[PDB]
Amino acid sequence: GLQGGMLYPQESPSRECKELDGLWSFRADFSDNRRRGFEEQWYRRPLWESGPTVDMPVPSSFNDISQDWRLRHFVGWVWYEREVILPERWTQDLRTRVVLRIGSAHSYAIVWVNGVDTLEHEGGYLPFEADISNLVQVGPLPSRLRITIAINNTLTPTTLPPGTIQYLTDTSKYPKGYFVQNTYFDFFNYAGLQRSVLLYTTPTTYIDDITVTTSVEQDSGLVNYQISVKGSNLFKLEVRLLDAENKVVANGTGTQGQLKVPGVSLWWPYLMHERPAYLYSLEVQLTAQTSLGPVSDFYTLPVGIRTVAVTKSQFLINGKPFYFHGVNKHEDADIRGKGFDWPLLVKDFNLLRWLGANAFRTSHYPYAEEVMQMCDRYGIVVIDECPGVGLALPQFFNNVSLHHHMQVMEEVVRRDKNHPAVVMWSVANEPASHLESAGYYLKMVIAHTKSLDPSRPVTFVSNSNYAADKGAPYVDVICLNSYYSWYHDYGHLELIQLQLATQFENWYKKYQKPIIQSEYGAETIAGFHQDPPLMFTEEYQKSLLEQYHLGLDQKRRKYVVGELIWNFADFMTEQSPTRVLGNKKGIFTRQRQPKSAAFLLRERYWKIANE
Amino acid sequence: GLQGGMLYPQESPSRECKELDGLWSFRADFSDNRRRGFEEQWYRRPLWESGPTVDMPVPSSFNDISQDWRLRHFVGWVWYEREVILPERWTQDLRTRVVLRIGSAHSYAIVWVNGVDTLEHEGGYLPFEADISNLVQVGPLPSRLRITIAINNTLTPTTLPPGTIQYLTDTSKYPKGYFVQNTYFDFFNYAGLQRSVLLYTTPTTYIDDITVTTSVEQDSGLVNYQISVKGSNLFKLEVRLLDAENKVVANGTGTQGQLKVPGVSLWWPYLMHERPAYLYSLEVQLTAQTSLGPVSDFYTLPVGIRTVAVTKSQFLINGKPFYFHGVNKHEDADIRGKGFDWPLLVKDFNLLRWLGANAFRTSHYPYAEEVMQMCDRYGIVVIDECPGVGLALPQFFNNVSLHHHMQVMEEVVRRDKNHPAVVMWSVANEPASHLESAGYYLKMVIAHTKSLDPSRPVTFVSNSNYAADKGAPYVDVICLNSYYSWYHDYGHLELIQLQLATQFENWYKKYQKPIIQSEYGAETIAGFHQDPPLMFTEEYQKSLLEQYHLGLDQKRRKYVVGELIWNFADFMTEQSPTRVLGNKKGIFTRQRQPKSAAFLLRERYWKIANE
Amino acid sequence: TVAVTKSQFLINGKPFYFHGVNKHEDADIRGKGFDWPLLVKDFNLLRWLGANAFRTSHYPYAEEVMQMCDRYGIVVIDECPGVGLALPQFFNNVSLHHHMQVMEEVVRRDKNHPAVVMWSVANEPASHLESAGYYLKMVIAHTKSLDPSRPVTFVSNSNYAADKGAPYVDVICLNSYYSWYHDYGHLELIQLQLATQFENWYKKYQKPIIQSEYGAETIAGFHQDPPLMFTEEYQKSLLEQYHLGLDQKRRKYVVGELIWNFADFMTEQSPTRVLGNKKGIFTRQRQPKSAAFLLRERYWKIANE
Ligand SMILES: *[C@@H]1O[C@H](CO)[C@@H](O[C@@H]2O[C@H](CO)[C@@H](O[C@@H]3O[C@H](CO[C@H]4O[C@H](CO[C@H]5O[C@H](CO)[C@@H](O)[C@H](O)[C@@H]5O[C@H]5O[C@H](CO)[C@@H](O)[C@H](O)[C@@H]5O)[C@@H](O)[C@H](O[C@H]5O[C@H](CO)[C@@H](O)[C@H](O)[C@@H]5O)[C@@H]4O)[C@@H](O)[C@H](O[C@H]4O[C@H](CO)[C@@H](O)[C@H](O)[C@@H]4O[C@H]4O[C@H](CO)[C@@H](O)[C@H](O)[C@@H]4O)[C@@H]3O)[C@H](O)[C@H]2NC(C)=O)[C@H](O)[C@H]1NC(C)=O
Numbered sequence A, B: 001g002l003q004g005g006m007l008y009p010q011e012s013p014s015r016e017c018k019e020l021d022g023l024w025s026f027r028a029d030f031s032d033n034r035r036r037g038f039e040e041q042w043y044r045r046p047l048w049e050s051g052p053t054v055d056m057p058v059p060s061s062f063n064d065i066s067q068d069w070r071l072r073h074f075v076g077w078v079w080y081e082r083e084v085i086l087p088e089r090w091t092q093d094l095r096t097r098v099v100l101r102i103g104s105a106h107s108y109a110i111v112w113v114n115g116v117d118t119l120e121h122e123g124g125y126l127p128f129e130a131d132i133s134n135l136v137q138v139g140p141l142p143s144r145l146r147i148t149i150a151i152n153n154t155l156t157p158t159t160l161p162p163g164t165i166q167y168l169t170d171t172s173k174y175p176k177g178y179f180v181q182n183t184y185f186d187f188f189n190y191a192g193l194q195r196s197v198l199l200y201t202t203p204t205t206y207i208d209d210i211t212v213t214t215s216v217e218q219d220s221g222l223v224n225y226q227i228s229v230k231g232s233n234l235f236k237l238e239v240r241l242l243d244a245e246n247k248v249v250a251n252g253t254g255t256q257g258q259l260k261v262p263g264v265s266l267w268w269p270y271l272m273h274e275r276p277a278y279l280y281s282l283e284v285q286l287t288a289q290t291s292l293g294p295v296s297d298f299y300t301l302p303v304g305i306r307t308v309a310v311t312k313s314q315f316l317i318n319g320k321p322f323y324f325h326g327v328n329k330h331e332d333a334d335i336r337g338k339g340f341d342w343p344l345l346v347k348d349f350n351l352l353r354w355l356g357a358n359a360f361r362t363s364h365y366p367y368a369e370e371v372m373q374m375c376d377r378y379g380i381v382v383i384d385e386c387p388g389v390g391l392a393l394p395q396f397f398n399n400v401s402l403h404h405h406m407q408v409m410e411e412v413v414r415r416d417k418n419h420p421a422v423v424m425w426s427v428a429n430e431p432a433s434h435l436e437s438a439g440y441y442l443k444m445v446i447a448h449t450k451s452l453d454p455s456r457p458v459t460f461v462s463n464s465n466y467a468a469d470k471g472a473p474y475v476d477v478i479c480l481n482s483y484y485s486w487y488h489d490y491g492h493l494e495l496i497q498l499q500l501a502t503q504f505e506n507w508y509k510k511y512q513k514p515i516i517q518s519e520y521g522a523e524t525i526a527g528f529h530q531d532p533p534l535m536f537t538e539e540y541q542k543s544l545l546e547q548y549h550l551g552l553d554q555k556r557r558k559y560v561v562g563e564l565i566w567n568f569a570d571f572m573t574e575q576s577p578t579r580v581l582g583n584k585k586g587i588f589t590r591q592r593q594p595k596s597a598a599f600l601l602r603e604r605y606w607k608i609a610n611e
Numbered sequence C: 001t002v003a004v005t006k007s008q009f010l011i012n013g014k015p016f017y018f019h020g021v022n023k024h025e026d027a028d029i030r031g032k033g034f035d036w037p038l039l040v041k042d043f044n045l046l047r048w049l050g051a052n053a054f055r056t057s058h059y060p061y062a063e064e065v066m067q068m069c070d071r072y073g074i075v076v077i078d079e080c081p082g083v084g085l086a087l088p089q090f091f092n093n094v095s096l097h098h099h100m101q102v103m104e105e106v107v108r109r110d111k112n113h114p115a116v117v118m119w120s121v122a123n124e125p126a127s128h129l130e131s132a133g134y135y136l137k138m139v140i141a142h143t144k145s146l147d148p149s150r151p152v153t154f155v156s157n158s159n160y161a162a163d164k165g166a167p168y169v170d171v172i173c174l175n176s177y178y179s180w181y182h183d184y185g186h187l188e189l190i191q192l193q194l195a196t197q198f199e200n201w202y203k204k205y206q207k208p209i210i211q212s213e214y215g216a217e218t219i220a221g222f223h224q225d226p227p228l229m230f231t232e233e234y235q236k237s238l239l240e241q242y243h244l245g246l247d248q249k250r251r252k253y254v255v256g257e258l259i260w261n262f263a264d265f266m267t268e269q270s271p272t273r274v275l276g277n278k279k280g281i282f283t284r285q286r287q288p289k290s291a292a293f294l295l296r297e298r299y300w301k302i303a304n305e
């Protein structure tokens, strides 16, 4: 675990304000260099004063909310700013700890709050917190916090997702300063503040970081806890566990211990128990004798008790077989890009249950916070990925890159190691794992996640030829991508069934382990129908899907333990001849309306769920 | 002005919390009667305990976020609930005034907060506030506010929008308890909490209600103010006015006065000044000797100085001619229904400027709060309507209804009488104004708005035959709806030009006043093209639009002072053979993508704006 | 042999059952135009659906009749024009006599085709009139004084007990559009409003029925859960309820069903009409819609019992 701690801001005796939503002053900086953004030090004086500002909502990518194409396709530094009114009690009580938090930035964020640079963060789709209390009480008066944040370009060889810039000196074509951003992943690299931006508070001695690990021992389960405090010297920690509402069912005492909750009541996925995702709540209460007396702090952490093992043929949750029949989603939708949205979150979770998908994959990057949604009665199992996307070029597998991927895997695991929904990790999606250097890098990143977190298996999804895949000897469960009929053998659904059964036989015969069909599908646009299936047509999709399902059924109850149709929905991708206004490969439209294939998938998922 | 006061919660020395966003427990109540919602008194014990609850986001209509058709088309009582954590200072300082506010409910809302029924409100698309401080400090301890709200059906003969229920006792057709909601307006009656839900605080003696009226007197303008306080006895009011940033440019002192700000700097609409919507800020500071000493309160109200007159031929803003070339919008979008959304607000305001529309009409009902958006540099003039929609049946014009419309017009005017953007009121849209009773009712409602607010003209838009329209002698400016080629003379764009010029001549020749083409357009779906224009086709729309513009150009610089193409975008309507998945009459799709007609409109709007 | 009971349509003595469609002579560019490419394509989709029947919607076609007889075996309902008989104006003797003439031309053109199992004198005319009940009286009569080899009928969209022409036909043709046209979007209402409509008509006319028209208008790329309007899904929900209903009367006394159109076709202009009628299960350009698939599972199913 990296030097710090992370728990999600959820008020109780010590609350949270939130500009996590709202309008914001904004500005893009360009014409040539990194530009004046820093050569004029815009940070030391209200953006408006610097030059022509604009409005920006949060959470929301700035890409689509405007009418200007150069902002849509910008690469460089981008600014924000907001003027908060600090409560009086905020700035005059010394027991309160006021922390600024961001749910996510881009490849680089610089926050200028506390009369200066207060925070910086590198890449990731993850959050970062600053300050302890210090709100520049030293010479101020009217508590008005001025926040400024600067953010960066699409990608680089050392970040994740990986990219590559490249200038093109007027070779008869391309203007003077023309440069381009080359990327190797299937999605548009949206930017801007797309998640939570909320100021919050705790006492000075706060429950910095808990952590629970669970299991099952006949007479019920038993939550094992770890806690971390920050400060004082003198304090006391006593934890208690309440069931469905608040029936106190257990109590421990220390900054380390156990909790054997009898009666039992595990966290089952939408799949099996009639009463699935069962959440018990852990109440961490700490009383510390600080400077100005013994202050207290509480947190309460939803604890879901469940076990996740694996064999050479079958995946097992709560010690019983579990077949994955879910989907791969994404954070995308008209206007807002990847910005967080409560209604689109709710619709999407009603559709998942509507379909009968009891699981999904954090498609190429960690998600908002809704991993708690997976926890709630919902019971939607999750395969958590980190941005190891376009790891195709051999250069992207250099040692700094490897050190970086080990950093990001500590953050991703920090943030989601508490969710009973997450049952597996993914360190990468379709890397050049056939390459020799990459197999090393993979064993590295992977063996590293096995440490830090020994509770659930690790893996990386691949489109690599068996026998040609170098990383595969190190994954605990096989994840395969194959688009037979698509990408190759254009229009040949008569081949799918054949080419499939083999890929599985070859994979298991070599690597003795559970395979998951982590990706399959055809690019379909609505309103296109052709009797003989043909191209980007609704029936074709029903045909490939139908045929793929045909191959999964032969080995499903053997060593194939999962199924993830490609996309839940259509999303935006970078502009290419093969991409028609994005990746039209989803069973639901971008506006969550179903396609003919959806109904079909819904039938299978429910049939299986009933077996 | 009705017994109360309303100002928008905007923190300063006395802040605001906000669950205005978030997830919420929810439940619809039905199977027959008003049902058990009250016969079991669900309000006196956590919804979960009552029965099977569900999640609901706010702001968002509950109509579309689910997969169940009976929730989509429900009529009756609907519940919500949330458990807030009250700050300690919240509940232990007696100087703080903690008010619960809702941005809007439906035809009926019942809020159960303060250990009981704390608030109720009838219809409208407007807000309501409760409590003063009383947070049940009397016998509580851990400040956890439990809020409950119940909401009602689609419509009735006395509400606004007007409706009619009707049972149909199994006449061979229709099941046992089958009843239907008959309505007479062109939109889907979405429900649920669709706007702000935010708890806030002030001291006990607070600036309850200000109000400014402005003008121009050669050497600059002069803001005239009114203030209202609530409580104490002893206090002092001194106001000051700062320009573009904070150059103090004026100061007054009292709870009534003037403010003659020299140098001048009026609020111009996107239309004319290169520096348009200029907002000065008014700082209301009040110090009152209460119980526990002289507490203070501040508000700061954006004041935009501008004058709006009218003649028998031309409309005049800032004393110069002003031609309306805007649009009619709506609150609607995939998933969220009519829920508030910051990114969709920003996109929509970029498109308005993109088009060149310097004005819009609050299409059949008051909008969220974004009337401040109209104020901001944007400078987007606004014609504010109240829900006088399906006033078609003669029954809907009964005396209680008339009293009601006078109530709602006090609220609508309370809430928006401060916006320098609003330049006109509309008390109704297409009423049966030919009917005799309705003309009386209209003169009533109208003469009533002229009182309360004598700053800007009043009107109601009509599709009534001149000579047949009874209310028309009472409007200050004529608003006409006509869909020549559409609705009649199906496909005859060769007639538009003819039928138009006449409607105008007949209207002005009788009624000597400025006409505004408040509505025109053709139902167009994207991807449909036909050389000879034809039906629901993009070219046809370019043709009718093109032809309508042809008729407006003849009288535009005479007595026709405005233009409002029908819809900015496509929206959802109740299901009918004439409505294809809603009102497809907009120049932009539901997802804000432009149609071929948009480009055309954009050209005209900009051409005119340049004249 | 083409017989007819009080409860069934007999073909060579073995009880029959129409499970086809209602078509039209409408194509892109060529409109009413005729050609073998579309002609053949159509018969291909026809055998495809399992449609073993089809009515010549509102007029006598071109040489498809040669085709139905031809190596196919698609039992047609030969239909004379006489469809817009809305106004009582259209009820004078002059025109009664005019209609009278065409039934000669039409039988004089199709007498021999084995395909044409039955004549249909008109479609959705103002049958609720006593004068119309007499106009239709004369022609139903005359038609059988021209061809006593097969039944006669006229497509009705009136309520039972107001149909003046109902007492003369030999098989009733009912045009219901529940959920559509009325009680907009109410799928849950269909199954019943339809039972009742087959309960009634029979309790009085005692003849065998044919659901000659049904469906919903649909724009191809449209999709929506909670079915909704001109949506592919809605059609799947409507069609389904109609099928769940007819199934109750099948084997009983209903002897056929005819999903409105085979494909979309142009119409005159109206805010109710998108770019002609859209109620078709194949696009104007002959491609399937989702339901085109749901109908054919019905057809082969039925044809297999
Ligand atoms: C926030 O956003 C920032 C903006 O995106 C971002 O900065 C950018 O980072 C990327 C990341 O790599 C940089 O991209 C690389 O650029 C290298 C070239 O760098 C040098 O040249 C730059 C451009 O300079 C010209 O243009 C400027 C803009 O007008 C002018 O100011 C200059 O005067 C100069 O003028 C020319 O350009 C115009 C016309 O084209 C016009 O001005 C004039 O007529 C003239 O033609 C410089 O800006 C840059 O400056 C930095 O470094 C120098 C010292 O090194 C300092 O003096 C500066 O202060 C500054 O620190 C450089 O001088 C490319 O080499 C590089 O390509 C190689 O690597 C990529 C992978 O990224 C490969 O795909 C590619 O094939 C190349 O491969 C090379 O390496 C391989 C091994 O991997 C090797 O085998 C092979 O041989 C090969 O050499 C890539 O394009 C980009 O330059 C930065 N932009 C800017 C504006 O600085 C910043 O990082 C972001 N912040 C964060 C934290 O993310």
Ligand SMILES: *[C@@H]1O[C@H](CO)[C@@H](O[C@@H]2O[C@H](CO)[C@@H](O[C@@H]3O[C@H](CO[C@H]4O[C@H](CO[C@H]5O[C@H](CO)[C@@H](O)[C@H](O)[C@@H]5O[C@H]5O[C@H](CO)[C@@H](O)[C@H](O)[C@@H]5O)[C@@H](O)[C@H](O[C@H]5O[C@H](CO)[C@@H](O)[C@H](O)[C@@H]5O)[C@@H]4O)[C@@H](O)[C@H](O[C@H]4O[C@H](CO)[C@@H](O)[C@H](O)[C@@H]4O[C@H]4O[C@H](CO)[C@@H](O)[C@H](O)[C@@H]4O)[C@@H]3O)[C@H](O)[C@H]2NC(C)=O)[C@H](O)[C@H]1NC(C)=O
Binding pocket: B032, B033, B034, B075, B076, B077, B107, B108, B152, B153, B156, B157, B163, B164, B165, B166, B167, B168, B169, B176, B177, B178, B395
């Ligand atoms: C929150 O949501 C609530 C739910 O929507 C909402 O309440 C509803 O308000 C509407 C508003 O009008 C009401 O609609 C009117 O209903 C009148 C009939 O009312 C009476 O009958 C109701 C139904 O009762 C049957 O059904 C119940 C449900 O199953 C059973 O419990 C009953 O036992 C009864 O059974 C029958 O129904 C079933 C089968 O159909 C089945 O149960 C059984 O087999 C049997 O067949 C009663 O609920 C209602 O009760 C109220 O009033 C009585 C006393 O009067 C009390 O005892 C009750 O406690 C309760 O307070 C009534 O008994 C209609 O008359 C009315 O139609 C007329 O008006 C409309 C305009 O609205 C016209 O369009 C229409 O043409 C009619 O016109 C009439 O007036 C004109 C003048 O304008 C006149 O010229 C003409 O002659 C004509 O008479 C309309 O349909 C609806 O009933 C309420 N629903 C419920 C469930 O109560 C509530 O208001 C919302 N809250 C707020 C604040 O908005």
